Amino acid sequence: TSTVRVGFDTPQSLSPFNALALPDYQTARLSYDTLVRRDAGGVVPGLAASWTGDAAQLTFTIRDGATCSDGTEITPTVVADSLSAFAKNAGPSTVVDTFGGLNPAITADDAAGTVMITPEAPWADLLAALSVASTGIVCPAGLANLDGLNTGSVEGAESGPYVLSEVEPGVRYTYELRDDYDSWPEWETTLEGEIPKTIEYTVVKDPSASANQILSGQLDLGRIMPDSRSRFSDSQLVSNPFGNFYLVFNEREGAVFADEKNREAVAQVLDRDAFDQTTTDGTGELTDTFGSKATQCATAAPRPALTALDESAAAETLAGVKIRLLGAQVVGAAGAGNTYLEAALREAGADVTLENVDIGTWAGRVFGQPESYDLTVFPDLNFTGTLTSGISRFTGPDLLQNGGNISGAVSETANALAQQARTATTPEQKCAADAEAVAALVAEHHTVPLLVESFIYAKRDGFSVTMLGGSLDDHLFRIT
Numbered sequence: 001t002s003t004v005r006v007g008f009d010t011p012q013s014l015s016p017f018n019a020l021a022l023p024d025y026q027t028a029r030l031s032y033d034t035l036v037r038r039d040a041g042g043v044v045p046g047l048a049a050s051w052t053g054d055a056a057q058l059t060f061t062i063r064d065g066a067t068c069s070d071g072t073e074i075t076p077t078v079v080a081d082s083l084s085a086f087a088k089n090a091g092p093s094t095v096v097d098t099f100g101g102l103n104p105a106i107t108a109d110d111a112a113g114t115v116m117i118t119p120e121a122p123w124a125d126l127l128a129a130l131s132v133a134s135t136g137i138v139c140p141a142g143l144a145n146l147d148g149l150n151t152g153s154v155e156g157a158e159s160g161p162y163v164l165s166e167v168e169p170g171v172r173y174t175y176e177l178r179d180d181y182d183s184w185p186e187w188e189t190t191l192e193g194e195i196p197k198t199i200e201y202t203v204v205k206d207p208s209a210s211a212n213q214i215l216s217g218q219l220d221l222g223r224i225m226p227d228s229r230s231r232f233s234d235s236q237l238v239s240n241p242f243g244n245f246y247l248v249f250n251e252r253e254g255a256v257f258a259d260e261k262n263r264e265a266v267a268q269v270l271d272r273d274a275f276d277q278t279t280t281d282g283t284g285e286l287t288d289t290f291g292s293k294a295t296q297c298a299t300a301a302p303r304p305a306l307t308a309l310d311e312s313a314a315a316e317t318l319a320g321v322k323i324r325l326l327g328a329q330v331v332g333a334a335g336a337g338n339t340y341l342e343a344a345l346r347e348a349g350a351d352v353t354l355e356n357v358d359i360g361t362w363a364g365r366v367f368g369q370p371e372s373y374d375l376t377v378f379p380d381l382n383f384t385g386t387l388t389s390g391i392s393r394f395t396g397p398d399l400l401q402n403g404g405n406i407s408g409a410v411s412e413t414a415n416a417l418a419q420q421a422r423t424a425t426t427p428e429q430k431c432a433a434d435a436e437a438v439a440a441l442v443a444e445h446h447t448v449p450l451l452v453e454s455f456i457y458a459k460r461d462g463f464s465v466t467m468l469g470g471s472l473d474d475h476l477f478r479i480t
């Protein structure tokens, strides 16, 4: 057999530029190629053979024999056109995350074979950001039709190994391997087995449905909730550390969590052990910061001072307070963590409405309609492997003003600390700024850092799956 059938969530977009949720990145990974790719000890050559520079400026030398699905030579102008189109068309949040601002300098040179990126101020995260599927290269046929990229394949747009051949919206996305592609990344790791010719990315509505369809052979790979583990042999399971979870409040003037006393009361109600039990059942790990111990600066001083549980004080504060609680269904099986949080808030006398929605709908709400909810457990994908990703959700200009500040938080201290992380002379001054920024954001009740989850793949005999270098959107499927 040459086909793999993979369980996944419904995409909200098949355009790299509009990618916000994991399924969007999963599809973008098959159809488009990024300049660099994740492997152990950092980043590996992909569509760029090598690069030079630092936080203030990077120069990528593009690789030879790189082709689009029509035949266009992938040249410096093709890449710079793609990366410019990304900078202009992607969500403000993911652009400032990639470039430290909305107006990077991007300039090709077909003679030199170079693509030069000059962020409007130094941005360390730029290199790691260009490993992320959403920065995958869109060939000229794709730039001609951006509305087309959203719903599936526009002939010749693909820089990547697969073309989406059949689409059944919200059901199945059938990918076929292109015969004219040997532009694989320069992996240091050796993978056992063969690149699948077909990938059937198959929407599962539910974790129970995921498990059943591995067990009955309707699926070859698929995500399992921790409760389903015992249905499988240890050999059928591949567990990786994945999303890092933390609270995000709507802190805008007139909203209930504009008032810090209300945010503190939520912190006083959220038992982090109980939240971990409901969400991961002990397959995950608690974290006081925006990442795991593998995250750059995540062990540097200072550690945040978390608000202690105080259910009595919280009951006085939240009596009849109206809370629009938005929940992603990845936060525990069918959003069980969001259910726990609603119940802890209701127990404190709050008038809580929970909307538990699929990851695609959740992402559209958080990034498109920020004023439409009060509180969410944010399941972050820390692509860049730094604390910067998380700090950006709470600092700088509001998302409403084309910034990355999802919450609309105004922390003077954290804003200034985000600025000194950028001016930092050394890695150590950078970690001290990042660490102090997280401590400040926790001390002022802008967030509660919760946990790092485990992504558990359950698989059938003859199928492997690998995640290299702590990567999140680069699931390496193989037939064995």
Ligand SMILES: NNC(=O)c1ccc(O)cc1
Pocket: 020, 021, 022, 023, 242, 243, 330, 359, 363, 379, 380, 381, 453, 455
């Ligand atoms: N935006 N966040 C996501 O798309 C996401 C999806 C699944 C996770 O297990 C974690 C994060």
